[PDB]
Amino acid sequence: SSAVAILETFQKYTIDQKKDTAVRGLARIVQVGENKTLFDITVNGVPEAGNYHASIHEKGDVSKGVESTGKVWHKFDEPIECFNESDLGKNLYSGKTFLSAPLPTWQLIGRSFVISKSLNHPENEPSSVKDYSFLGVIAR
Ligand SMILES: [Ca+2]
């Protein structure tokens, strides 16, 4: 059993001026046990280097980005380190990791996969937006 989440920004951020696509990462999801899923995560094109954090939120509603997705339903403890500079002109970064969760794929479908990091300079994209986030509905 497999699934995928295409991760896009929904918010507009001053620091993110890459306009050919809003896609900033991919989660490829494969069940690897009766009740265990593997998450193959890659990130690309994010403006700030740092440790990013993944969660799965309760709702598949991304109309308002993270703010419409409800609460955190599953949290991953392991960070995603994004320190590889992949765009020199724009100074954008990439990263990758494998994560796992003790959940079958069927319980994941239709929820939102979210990766986020606190903004280095929130005063310049204020004031209710604290985090840079990119997210996508999980689909079979
Ligand atoms: Ca940058």
PDB file of N, CA and C in Angstrom, residues 16-84:
ATOM      1  N   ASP A  16       9.935  34.110   0.219  1.00  0.00           N
ATOM      2  CA  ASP A  16       9.827  33.066  -0.816  1.00  0.00           C
ATOM      3  C   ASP A  16       9.397  33.709  -2.135  1.00  0.00           C
ATOM      4  N   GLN A  17      10.391  33.923  -2.999  1.00  0.00           N
ATOM      5  CA  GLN A  17      10.108  34.587  -4.272  1.00  0.00           C
ATOM      6  C   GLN A  17      10.305  33.632  -5.432  1.00  0.00           C
ATOM      7  N   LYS A  18      10.154  32.335  -5.146  1.00  0.00           N
ATOM      8  CA  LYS A  18      10.257  31.375  -6.267  1.00  0.00           C
ATOM      9  C   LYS A  18       8.838  31.126  -6.768  1.00  0.00           C
ATOM     10  N   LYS A  19       8.581  31.590  -7.981  1.00  0.00           N
ATOM     11  CA  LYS A  19       7.251  31.669  -8.547  1.00  0.00           C
ATOM     12  C   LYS A  19       7.018  30.680  -9.683  1.00  0.00           C
ATOM     13  N   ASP A  20       7.981  29.844 -10.052  1.00  0.00           N
ATOM     14  CA  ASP A  20       7.645  28.880 -11.112  1.00  0.00           C
ATOM     15  C   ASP A  20       6.770  27.751 -10.569  1.00  0.00           C
ATOM     16  N   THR A  21       6.831  27.494  -9.265  1.00  0.00           N
ATOM     17  CA  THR A  21       5.989  26.449  -8.656  1.00  0.00           C
ATOM     18  C   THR A  21       5.911  26.722  -7.161  1.00  0.00           C
ATOM     19  N   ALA A  22       4.868  26.282  -6.479  1.00  0.00           N
ATOM     20  CA  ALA A  22       4.812  26.454  -5.035  1.00  0.00           C
ATOM     21  C   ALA A  22       5.253  25.148  -4.360  1.00  0.00           C
ATOM     22  N   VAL A  23       5.619  24.138  -5.123  1.00  0.00           N
ATOM     23  CA  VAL A  23       6.002  22.841  -4.542  1.00  0.00           C
ATOM     24  C   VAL A  23       7.352  22.994  -3.848  1.00  0.00           C
ATOM     25  N   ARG A  24       7.438  22.579  -2.590  1.00  0.00           N
ATOM     26  CA  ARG A  24       8.681  22.666  -1.832  1.00  0.00           C
ATOM     27  C   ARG A  24       9.107  21.307  -1.303  1.00  0.00           C
ATOM     28  N   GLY A  25       8.321  20.255  -1.596  1.00  0.00           N
ATOM     29  CA  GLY A  25       8.829  18.957  -1.118  1.00  0.00           C
ATOM     30  C   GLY A  25       7.873  17.833  -1.503  1.00  0.00           C
ATOM     31  N   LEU A  26       8.237  16.612  -1.180  1.00  0.00           N
ATOM     32  CA  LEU A  26       7.404  15.443  -1.491  1.00  0.00           C
ATOM     33  C   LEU A  26       7.513  14.453  -0.347  1.00  0.00           C
ATOM     34  N   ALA A  27       6.397  13.877   0.040  1.00  0.00           N
ATOM     35  CA  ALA A  27       6.430  12.747   0.950  1.00  0.00           C
ATOM     36  C   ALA A  27       5.917  11.521   0.189  1.00  0.00           C
ATOM     37  N   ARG A  28       6.793  10.534   0.025  1.00  0.00           N
ATOM     38  CA  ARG A  28       6.346   9.282  -0.587  1.00  0.00           C
ATOM     39  C   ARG A  28       6.109   8.319   0.575  1.00  0.00           C
ATOM     40  N   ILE A  29       4.957   7.661   0.602  1.00  0.00           N
ATOM     41  CA  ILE A  29       4.567   6.927   1.804  1.00  0.00           C
ATOM     42  C   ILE A  29       4.335   5.475   1.417  1.00  0.00           C
ATOM     43  N   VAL A  30       4.972   4.542   2.093  1.00  0.00           N
ATOM     44  CA  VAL A  30       4.793   3.127   1.762  1.00  0.00           C
ATOM     45  C   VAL A  30       4.572   2.326   3.033  1.00  0.00           C
ATOM     46  N   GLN A  31       3.575   1.446   3.037  1.00  0.00           N
ATOM     47  CA  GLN A  31       3.426   0.606   4.228  1.00  0.00           C
ATOM     48  C   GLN A  31       4.497  -0.462   4.239  1.00  0.00           C
ATOM     49  N   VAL A  32       5.175  -0.662   5.369  1.00  0.00           N
ATOM     50  CA  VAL A  32       6.305  -1.571   5.414  1.00  0.00           C
ATOM     51  C   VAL A  32       6.085  -2.655   6.492  1.00  0.00           C
ATOM     52  N   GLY A  33       4.912  -2.607   7.086  1.00  0.00           N
ATOM     53  CA  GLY A  33       4.503  -3.588   8.085  1.00  0.00           C
ATOM     54  C   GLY A  33       2.995  -3.626   8.197  1.00  0.00           C
ATOM     55  N   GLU A  34       2.461  -4.617   8.912  1.00  0.00           N
ATOM     56  CA  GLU A  34       1.034  -4.661   9.199  1.00  0.00           C
ATOM     57  C   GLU A  34       0.572  -3.289   9.682  1.00  0.00           C
ATOM     58  N   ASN A  35       1.282  -2.740  10.672  1.00  0.00           N
ATOM     59  CA  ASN A  35       0.868  -1.407  11.127  1.00  0.00           C
ATOM     60  C   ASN A  35       2.047  -0.447  11.166  1.00  0.00           C
ATOM     61  N   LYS A  36       2.698  -0.265  10.029  1.00  0.00           N
ATOM     62  CA  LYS A  36       3.891   0.584  10.068  1.00  0.00           C
ATOM     63  C   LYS A  36       4.039   1.211   8.692  1.00  0.00           C
ATOM     64  N   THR A  37       4.246   2.541   8.652  1.00  0.00           N
ATOM     65  CA  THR A  37       4.478   3.191   7.368  1.00  0.00           C
ATOM     66  C   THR A  37       5.817   3.928   7.346  1.00  0.00           C
ATOM     67  N   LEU A  38       6.452   3.898   6.185  1.00  0.00           N
ATOM     68  CA  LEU A  38       7.712   4.566   5.910  1.00  0.00           C
ATOM     69  C   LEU A  38       7.426   5.876   5.179  1.00  0.00           C
ATOM     70  N   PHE A  39       8.072   6.966   5.563  1.00  0.00           N
ATOM     71  CA  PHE A  39       7.837   8.243   4.872  1.00  0.00           C
ATOM     72  C   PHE A  39       9.174   8.694   4.293  1.00  0.00           C
ATOM     73  N   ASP A  40       9.231   8.762   2.988  1.00  0.00           N
ATOM     74  CA  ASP A  40      10.441   9.124   2.263  1.00  0.00           C
ATOM     75  C   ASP A  40      10.295  10.600   1.903  1.00  0.00           C
ATOM     76  N   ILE A  41      10.993  11.449   2.649  1.00  0.00           N
ATOM     77  CA  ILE A  41      10.707  12.873   2.520  1.00  0.00           C
ATOM     78  C   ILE A  41      11.875  13.607   1.892  1.00  0.00           C
ATOM     79  N   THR A  42      11.530  14.446   0.913  1.00  0.00           N
ATOM     80  CA  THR A  42      12.547  15.334   0.342  1.00  0.00           C
ATOM     81  C   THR A  42      11.962  16.749   0.373  1.00  0.00           C
ATOM     82  N   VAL A  43      12.859  17.712   0.542  1.00  0.00           N
ATOM     83  CA  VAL A  43      12.551  19.140   0.567  1.00  0.00           C
ATOM     84  C   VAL A  43      13.462  19.818  -0.443  1.00  0.00           C
ATOM     85  N   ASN A  44      12.879  20.816  -1.134  1.00  0.00           N
ATOM     86  CA  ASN A  44      13.706  21.594  -2.048  1.00  0.00           C
ATOM     87  C   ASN A  44      13.181  23.005  -2.235  1.00  0.00           C
ATOM     88  N   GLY A  45      14.087  23.991  -2.336  1.00  0.00           N
ATOM     89  CA  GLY A  45      13.636  25.334  -2.652  1.00  0.00           C
ATOM     90  C   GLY A  45      13.211  26.171  -1.470  1.00  0.00           C
ATOM     91  N   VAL A  46      13.517  25.793  -0.220  1.00  0.00           N
ATOM     92  CA  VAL A  46      13.059  26.608   0.921  1.00  0.00           C
ATOM     93  C   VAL A  46      14.107  27.688   1.199  1.00  0.00           C
ATOM     94  N   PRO A  47      13.656  28.892   1.538  1.00  0.00           N
ATOM     95  CA  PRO A  47      14.620  30.004   1.675  1.00  0.00           C
ATOM     96  C   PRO A  47      15.536  29.965   2.891  1.00  0.00           C
ATOM     97  N   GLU A  48      15.097  29.415   4.009  1.00  0.00           N
ATOM     98  CA  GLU A  48      15.973  29.456   5.188  1.00  0.00           C
ATOM     99  C   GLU A  48      16.546  28.106   5.552  1.00  0.00           C
ATOM    100  N   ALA A  49      17.839  28.039   5.819  1.00  0.00           N
ATOM    101  CA  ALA A  49      18.372  26.735   6.276  1.00  0.00           C
ATOM    102  C   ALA A  49      17.884  26.452   7.683  1.00  0.00           C
ATOM    103  N   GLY A  50      17.794  25.174   8.046  1.00  0.00           N
ATOM    104  CA  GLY A  50      17.543  24.904   9.471  1.00  0.00           C
ATOM    105  C   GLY A  50      16.914  23.526   9.647  1.00  0.00           C
ATOM    106  N   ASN A  51      16.474  23.288  10.877  1.00  0.00           N
ATOM    107  CA  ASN A  51      15.787  22.037  11.165  1.00  0.00           C
ATOM    108  C   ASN A  51      14.286  22.243  10.972  1.00  0.00           C
ATOM    109  N   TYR A  52      13.700  21.438  10.079  1.00  0.00           N
ATOM    110  CA  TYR A  52      12.261  21.519   9.816  1.00  0.00           C
ATOM    111  C   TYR A  52      11.572  20.341  10.509  1.00  0.00           C
ATOM    112  N   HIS A  53      10.284  20.496  10.811  1.00  0.00           N
ATOM    113  CA  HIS A  53       9.616  19.485  11.635  1.00  0.00           C
ATOM    114  C   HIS A  53       8.361  19.031  10.900  1.00  0.00           C
ATOM    115  N   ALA A  54       8.086  17.734  10.960  1.00  0.00           N
ATOM    116  CA  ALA A  54       6.936  17.196  10.234  1.00  0.00           C
ATOM    117  C   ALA A  54       5.844  16.786  11.206  1.00  0.00           C
ATOM    118  N   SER A  55       4.611  16.975  10.757  1.00  0.00           N
ATOM    119  CA  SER A  55       3.462  16.470  11.509  1.00  0.00           C
ATOM    120  C   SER A  55       2.375  16.103  10.515  1.00  0.00           C
ATOM    121  N   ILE A  56       1.398  15.336  11.019  1.00  0.00           N
ATOM    122  CA  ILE A  56       0.204  15.097  10.192  1.00  0.00           C
ATOM    123  C   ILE A  56      -0.955  15.741  10.930  1.00  0.00           C
ATOM    124  N   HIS A  57      -1.730  16.575  10.261  1.00  0.00           N
ATOM    125  CA  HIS A  57      -2.771  17.337  10.949  1.00  0.00           C
ATOM    126  C   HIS A  57      -4.114  16.642  10.698  1.00  0.00           C
ATOM    127  N   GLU A  58      -5.123  17.000  11.494  1.00  0.00           N
ATOM    128  CA  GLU A  58      -6.310  16.151  11.492  1.00  0.00           C
ATOM    129  C   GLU A  58      -7.138  16.269  10.218  1.00  0.00           C
ATOM    130  N   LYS A  59      -7.249  17.455   9.632  1.00  0.00           N
ATOM    131  CA  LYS A  59      -8.111  17.682   8.480  1.00  0.00           C
ATOM    132  C   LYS A  59      -7.331  17.794   7.176  1.00  0.00           C
ATOM    133  N   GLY A  60      -7.969  17.412   6.081  1.00  0.00           N
ATOM    134  CA  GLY A  60      -7.429  17.577   4.747  1.00  0.00           C
ATOM    135  C   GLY A  60      -7.815  18.915   4.150  1.00  0.00           C
ATOM    136  N   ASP A  61      -8.172  19.900   4.967  1.00  0.00           N
ATOM    137  CA  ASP A  61      -8.589  21.199   4.442  1.00  0.00           C
ATOM    138  C   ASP A  61      -7.400  22.163   4.426  1.00  0.00           C
ATOM    139  N   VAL A  62      -6.828  22.426   3.248  1.00  0.00           N
ATOM    140  CA  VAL A  62      -5.702  23.334   3.106  1.00  0.00           C
ATOM    141  C   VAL A  62      -6.169  24.641   2.463  1.00  0.00           C
ATOM    142  N   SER A  63      -7.468  24.955   2.582  1.00  0.00           N
ATOM    143  CA  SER A  63      -7.908  26.203   1.952  1.00  0.00           C
ATOM    144  C   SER A  63      -7.159  27.397   2.524  1.00  0.00           C
ATOM    145  N   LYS A  64      -6.782  27.338   3.797  1.00  0.00           N
ATOM    146  CA  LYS A  64      -6.126  28.475   4.443  1.00  0.00           C
ATOM    147  C   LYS A  64      -4.740  28.067   4.921  1.00  0.00           C
ATOM    148  N   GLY A  65      -4.151  27.106   4.199  1.00  0.00           N
ATOM    149  CA  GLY A  65      -2.836  26.632   4.592  1.00  0.00           C
ATOM    150  C   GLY A  65      -2.926  25.842   5.885  1.00  0.00           C
ATOM    151  N   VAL A  66      -1.904  25.967   6.734  1.00  0.00           N
ATOM    152  CA  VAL A  66      -1.936  25.213   7.980  1.00  0.00           C
ATOM    153  C   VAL A  66      -3.121  25.605   8.853  1.00  0.00           C
ATOM    154  N   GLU A  67      -3.483  26.892   8.826  1.00  0.00           N
ATOM    155  CA  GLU A  67      -4.514  27.333   9.771  1.00  0.00           C
ATOM    156  C   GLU A  67      -5.832  26.623   9.530  1.00  0.00           C
ATOM    157  N   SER A  68      -6.094  26.067   8.346  1.00  0.00           N
ATOM    158  CA  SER A  68      -7.397  25.394   8.268  1.00  0.00           C
ATOM    159  C   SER A  68      -7.305  23.901   8.507  1.00  0.00           C
ATOM    160  N   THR A  69      -6.142  23.368   8.887  1.00  0.00           N
ATOM    161  CA  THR A  69      -6.016  21.911   8.910  1.00  0.00           C
ATOM    162  C   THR A  69      -6.332  21.281  10.268  1.00  0.00           C
ATOM    163  N   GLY A  70      -6.728  22.103  11.220  1.00  0.00           N
ATOM    164  CA  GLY A  70      -7.016  21.665  12.578  1.00  0.00           C
ATOM    165  C   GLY A  70      -5.752  21.296  13.334  1.00  0.00           C
ATOM    166  N   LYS A  71      -5.933  20.548  14.421  1.00  0.00           N
ATOM    167  CA  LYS A  71      -4.835  20.225  15.314  1.00  0.00           C
ATOM    168  C   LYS A  71      -3.886  19.175  14.759  1.00  0.00           C
ATOM    169  N   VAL A  72      -2.777  19.040  15.486  1.00  0.00           N
ATOM    170  CA  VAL A  72      -1.782  18.021  15.170  1.00  0.00           C
ATOM    171  C   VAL A  72      -2.314  16.643  15.570  1.00  0.00           C
ATOM    172  N   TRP A  73      -2.281  15.693  14.658  1.00  0.00           N
ATOM    173  CA  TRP A  73      -2.838  14.354  14.841  1.00  0.00           C
ATOM    174  C   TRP A  73      -1.729  13.343  15.065  1.00  0.00           C
ATOM    175  N   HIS A  74      -0.617  13.511  14.338  1.00  0.00           N
ATOM    176  CA  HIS A  74       0.594  12.751  14.654  1.00  0.00           C
ATOM    177  C   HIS A  74       1.811  13.677  14.527  1.00  0.00           C
ATOM    178  N   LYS A  75       2.709  13.662  15.488  1.00  0.00           N
ATOM    179  CA  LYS A  75       3.947  14.417  15.472  1.00  0.00           C
ATOM    180  C   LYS A  75       5.158  13.521  15.286  1.00  0.00           C
ATOM    181  N   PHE A  76       6.075  13.887  14.404  1.00  0.00           N
ATOM    182  CA  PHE A  76       7.328  13.158  14.271  1.00  0.00           C
ATOM    183  C   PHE A  76       8.389  13.862  15.131  1.00  0.00           C
ATOM    184  N   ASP A  77       9.111  13.078  15.923  1.00  0.00           N
ATOM    185  CA  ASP A  77      10.135  13.714  16.774  1.00  0.00           C
ATOM    186  C   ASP A  77      11.401  14.065  16.015  1.00  0.00           C
ATOM    187  N   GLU A  78      11.707  13.304  14.958  1.00  0.00           N
ATOM    188  CA  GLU A  78      13.001  13.456  14.313  1.00  0.00           C
ATOM    189  C   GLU A  78      12.995  14.658  13.380  1.00  0.00           C
ATOM    190  N   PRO A  79      13.959  15.565  13.458  1.00  0.00           N
ATOM    191  CA  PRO A  79      13.898  16.685  12.506  1.00  0.00           C
ATOM    192  C   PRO A  79      14.401  16.335  11.124  1.00  0.00           C
ATOM    193  N   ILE A  80      14.032  17.240  10.208  1.00  0.00           N
ATOM    194  CA  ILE A  80      14.475  17.184   8.836  1.00  0.00           C
ATOM    195  C   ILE A  80      15.536  18.288   8.665  1.00  0.00           C
ATOM    196  N   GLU A  81      16.784  17.877   8.499  1.00  0.00           N
ATOM    197  CA  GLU A  81      17.829  18.910   8.408  1.00  0.00           C
ATOM    198  C   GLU A  81      17.976  19.478   7.013  1.00  0.00           C
ATOM    199  N   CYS A  82      17.709  20.780   6.844  1.00  0.00           N
ATOM    200  CA  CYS A  82      17.855  21.351   5.497  1.00  0.00           C
ATOM    201  C   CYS A  82      18.981  22.387   5.458  1.00  0.00           C
ATOM    202  N   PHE A  83      20.207  21.936   5.191  1.00  0.00           N
ATOM    203  CA  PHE A  83      21.364  22.811   5.155  1.00  0.00           C
ATOM    204  C   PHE A  83      22.114  22.728   3.836  1.00  0.00           C
ATOM    205  N   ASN A  84      21.672  21.904   2.891  1.00  0.00           N
ATOM    206  CA  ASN A  84      22.336  21.803   1.577  1.00  0.00           C
ATOM    207  C   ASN A  84      21.841  22.921   0.683  1.00  0.00           C
TER     208      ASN A  84
END
